[PDB]
Amino acid sequence: GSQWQPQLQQLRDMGIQDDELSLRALQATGGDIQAALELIFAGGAP
Amino acid sequence: MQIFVKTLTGKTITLEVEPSDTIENVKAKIQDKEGIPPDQQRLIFAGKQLEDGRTLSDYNIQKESTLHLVLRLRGG
Numbered sequence: 692g693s694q695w696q697p698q699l700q701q702l703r704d705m706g707i708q709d710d711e712l713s714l715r716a717l718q719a720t721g722g723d724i725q726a727a728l729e730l731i732f733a734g735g736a737p
Numbered sequence: 738m739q740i741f742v743k744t745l746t747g748k749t750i751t752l753e754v755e756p757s758d759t760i761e762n763v764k765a766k767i768q769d770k771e772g773i774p775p776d777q778q779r780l781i782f783a784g785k786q787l788e789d790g791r792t793l794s795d796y797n798i799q800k801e802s803t804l805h806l807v808l809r810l811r812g813g
Contacts, residue, residue, distance in 0.1 A: 706805030734810025
């Protein structure tokens with residue numbers, strides 16, 4: 692299992708397919724959905 | 738018909754397209770007003786992946802539908 696496993700699903704249902712990018716974003720943010728959205732949107736840390 | 742393209746951050750843009758418009762053309766229109774290349778335009782309709790070769794009517798996308806413009810960049 693994963694600490695952000697349920698989080699990935701929440702993102703997927705909203706409009707995400709790649710759980711990999713979702714995990715990477717969640718990992719970079721430390722566990723934040725909205726912040727992760729900006730992470731992917733910017734393509735990492737601007 | 739009028740559609741609503743809402744990004745991940747929250748930015749929502751209005752787009753004027755027809756039911757016979759291809760998803761690919763949609764991305765081309767978004768790029769012209771947003772400056773975002775179709776390459777990063779991973780348009781996902783609440784989980785439903787929108788294939789570029791398909792049309793808006795293909796996915797039963799009605800008017801006032803909210804499409805999610807997911808910018809999939811290589812980073813993170």
